[PDB]
Symmetry: D2
Subunit: 295 residues, 4 copies
């Protein structure tokens, strides 16, 4: 037997950082969960019990805190690139670092119409994520994403004209509820190294904001022919607005809300045009994916 | 042996209702999870296998949907009171109904600064809840609550002057992070029945809004001497603003964020006045409760 | 306003303890999650920002570890009683301690038919719990429980003869699946103090074992007329076997498995006597409770 | 823009099947959660709103139930292969099916030392999984796995001789707790189609049993030099015992249990050789992966 692939490191490292403005007294907080996995010439730790090649995962944890102390943690694309680069440069035998960051929302509170200087609220479990792969001699690959964005529209979704055979019971519809949890990922063109990532720093927050805005607007305004057709419209627009993105991937559950026939009870009308009360279904769910690139 | 207490019913009944305005085209959605448990002269189902006294839990589920079809579902205090009253009036041998409702957020989307007519976003997992106990001959007891409201302040929290003995290692502090998930419950004076609940309908949404606003403002503005002292200030204000509340209960975790000493690494300064990077702790947590009433 | 009730302390304190037998080399591990909440003359911490009355929750955490170091941690009824008693005796102004312990399973591994001296497996998320309330001058109240015991029987459950009215759609059945997650609690007679708890130490593990065995056997062997009737049989037997128990409470979900009519597809027969494939329902669920005491 | 990749289908389809032995009266239950995603010539549903190419996800759900009705559901490798093959053969334009199955434990109850004919217990949240990829003209790729197997050993784990630099604070140790949740996957050689999968049916359950046994025995008996070294020993043995496996992948968290220094309290000794009480850490955790193949 032989080691075909190996990676190891520290997961679930929770980090908070506060920035305090000297002049204004305004404080800004960042909170993330970080995972760092390393690859390189480490096979002998597995095959020969040779720990001399292991950078302890506890040390990786220390490094994350030290790096956060000495560098900005925003945008997360930059922080992940700094962190991954550190490992490949510091350790001769480590040749790849894989950094995953989940950013948690701490939104500044408005009290009496004024933004508060040091108080924050978690408005939703929506996350902003990055995956940064730093590979020695191959540059820096970054995938940025948003996840946990849960939306619902109560009309202006349709689904008809699908294949019908002996396995089909679903009725065609011209008016249904559409609800989903949005997972959207945009993959950046490969960067040559940290200097190039630094050169594009303003584009990261701007592209996240664009991706979010395009997702919300398209969802709200499309008279949707299917999840497939609506998601494609979203991806098309993001690619058009940021030339440094190579691909956009969406993964969308279709969280079903079923009509409830109440006609057995005193002829009560609650289906089709009379539908007011629905039963949300926890499972099963549709799951629709697509990756869109440039032609 | 004897049955000392018994209750039974249906839990986790998910319900969605849409209201469609005829003139404006604006749609409004409500989504809740409902539990209904009944009590009454039902001992023989347990002791003698006599099912004749059982209103099937499946029928309770049907009743929830039918009731939602025929009545407003907002405010939840009213809907719960209608639902509980139904069971005690419909069935001679049922003498108490216990209705718990969790309301999920579907907040109307703003697209290009305009509120969208039929698109919604789940902004946070904060819930608005009610517990309604309808007891034949004893009226209607309602407890209203908000839960899952997660906040953090990065300064203006202190904790010093506590008891110090041979079990104590905690250092006094004049500047710490305070973060919590707010669970706040206000208990209404007993209502004589459904007519009286109807008479107070406008107070329910107003008091929820007040409780939320008082919680947020007090948290943000108090230079907190402890969780205990800040929570008491919140409860005091709610009681002052709504005379029909008898008690206010708060239950607050203290979600710790620990300083990280980095001085072992090149004398890096990250404690006290130099603290920038902290380690959020998943567990353990402080848990502080109090119930405040009128003197 | 006035403080009507207050309690505070530390939740989610994870504790592991190992016992090493000197002669045999056999090791035994215990892992628990502990919560301790205190009450007493502490109102002024809430109303006057007087921290002098607060035993810091961090100190409560230290005390749990110290107590576990110096005392057996099994049975949990004894450990909880020691822990609660400590607080009321050590601090003049603390008059009640409320201790909740969840015990996690670490079952010794069998390797090649022999029990291993120091290796363990988590066989299921079933827990053994205690709630111990130590109240100065009122002794020690203990509630013991098991929870998270998930079972299913595929036949020998019936449900017919229930009330049928205009809200009822459920069909009577003489053969259904019954599946539940068992939550069973037995409440001990009040103990005068720690000496009395010590005197009954062997009864705690024995009664837990009995409660578990009675639950499993009754579930498996009863030709169940309803969840109500089967649960009552369980409680009756536990009360008969342990005279120091005052009440037994069961709380049982009815986790539904629905038939799937496949007759639309080539007349395939999958209902009633031909039912083989079912759809487990995540929600809603029945919820049936009862408390049984001595007549 | 162009569709680069697309797949869609139904997730979280819960399925239960019962087998009833005619002669013996013994019943056996199976419960699984199934996901099926399809690929093929479906781009136009995304780009042109052409639903004619969509097999509705609701129909995929129906197909799963029908397939379970007409075929054995065990071993899951066979059921997944039947299910995936159905889609590529039935629909001309569907060219790949991806089937994921999670099998839930329902272990027959022993009552009074005898196996019960129709009563079952969920003994642990350990799962047995398969991933089956059926690709038209490329055969059937199967990855089998076990997950959620949680173990702990209280001694006979060491970790010393790792790299030490200015980022390192971890002390070397010759005696520590090792606890993990095992995720192990074995990848089968490609099969040409369903006939070949059928020919190997007995090997599937046998190899699962072997993988489980090797994991448990190696974990219990290895005087572990690191997670890396122990996991490699496991994988080596599985590959040696089943020639039809090409690779074995392990993914293991290192769930830390920290010593608690209690010496500040009356010189209490609880570290090194005197360590009895430990603090389990919820996060962060080490994460160690490796894929082992044939040389
Ligand atoms: O938008 C949808 N896409 C689909 O593929 C599908 N299948 N069933 N319902 C559906 N809705
Ligand atoms: O606000 C606090 N209240 C308390 O009771 C406490 N105990 N430790 N830290 C604390 N902080
Ligand atoms: O055992 C049962 N008890 C009940 O109260 C009930 N109601 N619906 N189905 C049921 N099954
Ligand atoms: O077994 C281990 N492997 C590692 O890579 C490691 N790093 N810190 N502790 C560790 N333990
Ligand atoms: Na390197
Ligand atoms: Na009544
Ligand atoms: Na006392
Ligand atoms: Na095909």
């Amino acid at each position: 037997s032989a080691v075909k692939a190996a990676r190891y490191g520290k997961d679930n490292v929770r980090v908070y950082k506060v920035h305090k403005d000297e002049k204004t007294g305004v404080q800004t907080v960042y909170e993330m969960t970080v995972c760092v996995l390393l690859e390189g010439e480490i096979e002998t730790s597995y095959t020969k019990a040779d720990n001399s090649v292991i950078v302890a995962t506890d040390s990786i944890k220390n490094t994350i805190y030290i790096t956060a102390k000495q560098n900005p943690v925003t945008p997360p694309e930059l922080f992940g690139s700094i962190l991954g680069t550190h490992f490949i440069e510091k350790y001769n035998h480590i040749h790849a670092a894989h950094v995953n960051i989940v950013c948690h929302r701490w939104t500044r509170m408005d009290i009496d119409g004024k933004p508060h200087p040091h108080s924050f609220i978690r408005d939703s479990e929506e996350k902003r994520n990055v995956q940064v792969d730093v590979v020695e001699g191959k540059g820096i690959d970054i995938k940025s994403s948003l996840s946990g964005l849960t939306v619902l529209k109560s009309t202006n979704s349709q689904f008809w004209g699908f294949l019908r055979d002996e396995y089909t019971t679903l009725k065609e519809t011209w008016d249904r509820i559409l609800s989903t949890d949005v997972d959207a990922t945009w993959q950046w063109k490969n960067f040559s190294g940290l200097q190039e990532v630094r050169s594009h720093v303003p584009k990261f927050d701007a592209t996240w904001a664009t991706a979010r805005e395009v997702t919300l607007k398209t969802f709200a305004e499309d008279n949707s022919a299917s999840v497939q057709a609506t998601m494609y419209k979203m991806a098309e627009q993001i690619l058009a607005r940021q030339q440094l993105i190579e691909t956009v991937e969406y993964s969308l559950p279709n969280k079903h809300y079923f009509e409830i026939d109440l006609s057995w009870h005193k002829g009560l009308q609650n289906t089709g045009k009379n539908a007011e009360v629905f039963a949300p279904q926890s499972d099963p769910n549709g799951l629709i994916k697509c990756t869109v690139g440039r032609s």
